[PDB]
């Protein structure tokens, strides 16, 4: 079944750091970064070759207008929220995450959520056409937004506009989004303090989902096995590592198995001398 996702996130910060923009705003198709806006540049730029190639100047100017609009409102929001929480100065952030998921071309999810200082604040419940207040300070936002009848317009964006654009983007980037890149895998070992730690590292795979397991006696061994999760490379590919602790002299009893969409059968790898 063909699943696709469009997600926009944005952050407004009181303390981004020296030289850095206080407002950053990015979009993702199927988890791949494709657009970026910030408060210094004051425009959206492409982050994939397919959007650069297929979008025209009207698209960029139109998105830039939205970015500038959102920058302005989130600047206001930071001030509003600091006052609501009775806070002056210090480090504070407003974050938003929203978008849509489609399955065989049809919408299966639409969401619109905010966090303040890293904790859930409000979310749209599209099913009841209300806004949730995760914390007491969000009750005035719920009230304001429900009284203003914004739910209709937000539902239309999430079920129509978002979906239409996601369908277009998936067409623009079909070959790139559907590609497979095989991991290059290395097993490495280090002994210390009477423990042989074996590492299985998979470099450069796409898409992101992978399973990397340590086997002993034919069986997956999660005991003393630790995964670093899936982390990004610079280039649209991913990395993962998994370790297991073994007894010195037991190295040849272990085998790493890698399951990934690029590999018709799982890869199997052992520790070389």
């Amino acid at each position: 079944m063909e699943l696709h996702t469009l997600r926009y996130i944005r952050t407004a910060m009181t303390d981004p750091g020296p030289g850095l923009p206080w407002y950053v705003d990015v979009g993702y198709v199927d988890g791949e970064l494709f657009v970026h806006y910030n408060s210094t540049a004051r425009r959206y730029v492409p982050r994939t070759e397919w959007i650069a190639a297929k979008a025209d100047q009207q698209y960029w100017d139109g998105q830039t207008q939205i970015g500038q609009g959102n920058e302005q409102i989130d600047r206001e929001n930071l001030g509003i929220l600091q006052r609501r929480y009775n806070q002056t100065g210090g480090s504070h952030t407003v974050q938003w995450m929203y978008g849509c998921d489609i399955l065989e071309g049809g919408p299966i999810r639409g969401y619109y959520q905010m966090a303040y200082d890293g904790r859930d604040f409000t979310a749209f419940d599209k099913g009841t056409m209300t806004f949730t207040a995760a914390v007491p300070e969000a009750v005035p936002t719920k009230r304001k937004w429900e009284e203003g009848d914004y739910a209709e317009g937000l539902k239309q964006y999430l079920e129509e506009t978002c979906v239409e654009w996601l369908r277009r983007y998936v067409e623009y980037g079909k070959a790139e989004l559907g590609r497979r890149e095989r991991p290059e895998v290395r097993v490495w070992g280090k002994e210390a303090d009477g423990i042989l730690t074996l590492s299985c590292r998979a470099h450069g795979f796409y898409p992101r989902p992978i399973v990397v397991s340590w086997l002993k006696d034919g069986a997956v061994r999660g005991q003393d096995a630790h995964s670093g999760g899936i982390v990004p490379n610079g280039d649209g590919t991913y990395h993962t590592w998994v370790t297991i602790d073994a007894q010195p002299g037991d190295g040849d009893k272990y085998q790493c198995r890698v399951e990934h969409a690029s590999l018709p059968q799982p890869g199997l790898y052992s520790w070389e001398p």
Partner: peptide
């Protein structure tokens, strides 16, 4: 496309 926020909090 992104969405322009409809109202401040």
């Amino acid at each position: 496309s992104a969405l322009q926020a409809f109202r401040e909090v």
